[PDB]
Write a protein that binds this ligand. Structure first.
Ligand code: E8E
Length: 300
């Protein structure tokens, strides 16, 4: 029992994080093989005014880099620029490099953030990429370069995020490991305004299934709405569309409650809980994916 937003264990990733200094700017990088990936704004002469990156890159000198792993120096051999990241070739290889790939997130995907400062991990937490290509994180000065990841069943680490931006709203943006900034935000300290966040319908359906399976059923209306009607309502009320009903077949069978009944309940519960709670939450929750709910109720 219970449902809790968790991180996948962080050990394999903790050994990949390094301190990258250029001039007096310090942030984090990710050390895999003999390459350190970091946000390209580390070579900006200032990050408080518009940055001419071509100029900053062509004026850059290697000797201004200082890359270190836990206080141990790491020599810089070369630097290339790829979208919003640098790939810094270094003279030592990371012998703790895990089996890994690079992967780009899509909205609705869960992943893990290892929040780091000056090459050191301080925190780990699960988050979702929102429809507006932001996340809601917790980062202060120094967090840039913190990696996001997922761990596949076989132990393969998918590196999928690199922290870069805090929007004027406080929401957070990164790039992937190719240097594409999520949502095509720009890696500039200019005002950029994200689209309005859409509640992830698929996750809210999962959440309600989790509530049924934990004995919380008071909110259940005896109403049904189909996917097409729900999707139309969702446009008007800040929700995404819902995917295939069949994705939920194991949970529909275990609870006896169809998706369509959950879709109606979301419509009704959107009006508020009336001072009551579901699994302790005072409004609908779109934090958990179906995969997370299944893993936390059954996944062994
Ligand atoms: C990131 O550069 C970082 O951690 N840098 C190291 C560092 C910065 C400052 C002092 C010491 C060390 C930060 C991370 C931000 C900072 C606060 N919380 C975070 O997540 N990233 C930035 O400062 C961004 C740099 C850009 C060049 C990409 N700044 C912005 O995203 C600014 C946005 C903005 C400016 C003006 C009006 C609205 C929005």
């Amino acid at each position: 029992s219970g449902l809790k937003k968790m991180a996948q264990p962080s050990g394999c990733v903790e050994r990949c994080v390094v301190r990258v200094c250029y001039g007096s700017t310090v942030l984090n990088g990710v050390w895999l093989g003999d390459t350190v990936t970091c946000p390209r704004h580390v070579i900006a002469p200032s990050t408080t005014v518009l940055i001419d990156y071509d100029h900053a890159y062509s004026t850059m000198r290697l000797h201004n880099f200082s890359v270190s792993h836990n206080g141990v120096f790491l020599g810089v051999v070369g630097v290339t620029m790829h979208g919003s990241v640098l790939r810094i070739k270094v003279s030592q290889s990371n012998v703790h490099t895990p089996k890994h790939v690079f992967k780009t997130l899509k909205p609705g995907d869960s992943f893990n953030i290892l929040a780091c400062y000056e090459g050191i991990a301080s925190g780990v937490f699960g988050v979702n990429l929102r429809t507006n290509f932001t996340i809601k994180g917790s980062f202060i000065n120094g967090a840039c370069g913190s990696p996001g990841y997922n761990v596949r069943n076989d132990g393969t680490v998918e590196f999928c995020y690199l922290h870069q931006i805090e929007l004027g709203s406080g929401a957070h943006v990164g790039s992937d490991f190719t240097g594409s900034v999520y949502g095509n935000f720009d890696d500039q300290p200019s005002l950029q305004v994200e689209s309005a966040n859409l509640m992830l319908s698929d996750n809210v359906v999962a959440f309600l299934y989790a509530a049924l399976l934990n004995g919380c059923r008071w909110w259940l209306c005896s109403t049904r709405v189909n996917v097409d009607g729900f999707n139309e309502w969702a446009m008007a009320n800040g929700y995404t569309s819902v995917s295939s009903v069949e994705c939920y077949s194991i949970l529909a069978a275990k609870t006896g409650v169809s998706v369509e009944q959950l879709l109606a309940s979301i419509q009704h519960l959107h009006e508020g809980f009336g001072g009551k709670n579901i699994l302790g939450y005072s409004s609908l929750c779109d934090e958990f994916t179906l995969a997370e709910v299944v893993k936390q109720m059954y996944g062994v």
